[PDB]
Design a binder for these strands. Sequence first.
DNA 1: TTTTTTTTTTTTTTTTTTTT
Lengths: 122, 178
Amino acid sequence: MASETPRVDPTEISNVNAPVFRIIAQIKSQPTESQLILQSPTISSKNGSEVEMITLNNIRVSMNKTFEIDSWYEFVCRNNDDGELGFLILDAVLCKFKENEDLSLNGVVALQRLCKKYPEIY
Amino acid sequence: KFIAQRITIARAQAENLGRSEKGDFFSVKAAISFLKVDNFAYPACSNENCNKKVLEQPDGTWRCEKCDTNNARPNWRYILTISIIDETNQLWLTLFDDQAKQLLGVDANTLMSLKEEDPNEFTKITQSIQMNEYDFRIRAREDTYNDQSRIRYTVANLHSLNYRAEADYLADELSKAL
DNA sequence: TTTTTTTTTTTTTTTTTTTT
């Protein structure tokens, strides 16, 4: 909305308690529609940082927001402060780049890092 | 292995110079601001490598001075330039027949016949093509006509649609900053 | 892995939507 909605890493759930944020990562298909797998690697492989995947529980909320395979989506979500639950799915934006081409997540990760160290600029 | 690092137009005039007399163009990533409505395409004869500008004798058909011929189709060549803006400076770029023909994807004869045409689609193409982002290879030279001399720039090439390489390159530059 | 032959030396882009 009109408030601050920075892009944060899905592993920052411990740092910030129940914010409203957007996530850009890879969407995987679960056996059911009530769960979600977020694949978010970081830069190089053997540099000491590996693929960071976070599993969420979709339940019955946002049925029409189901994500297409291999497609990208901007995740507008709010973290749950109770327990044993991931980020509550609220809104999703259609995200794709071009045809016969792809995008490396590294440029996104360096994004989500900078806005953490520099709150003045988004 | 692609061209990534470059400089700006503000850094083009003086950066730790010189560089006394020597350089050949360089790469620029700059947005397009406005397209001039005057001096678009000058007419000439239809032939390969025409260096002459035809004039009008008291005839009504275009006449070439060096090569005597009757011109059925006054083939137009692009004299049109553009006004561009970059991260710092606002500059002007002169485009040739291939550069201006590649910019809007329309030839010079079809553009001239499009302007004089009854529909208004000429201004629709002019306003639709303007305000975009483009990549050029620009060189600087100083020419003098009579009393007035200044440095002007030209476009030696056009490149666009590159996105992923710039984002990943800047990401690598951010990772190498530590 | 990049080396001129097609002019003249200026150039105006959006000029009207807005409180007491």
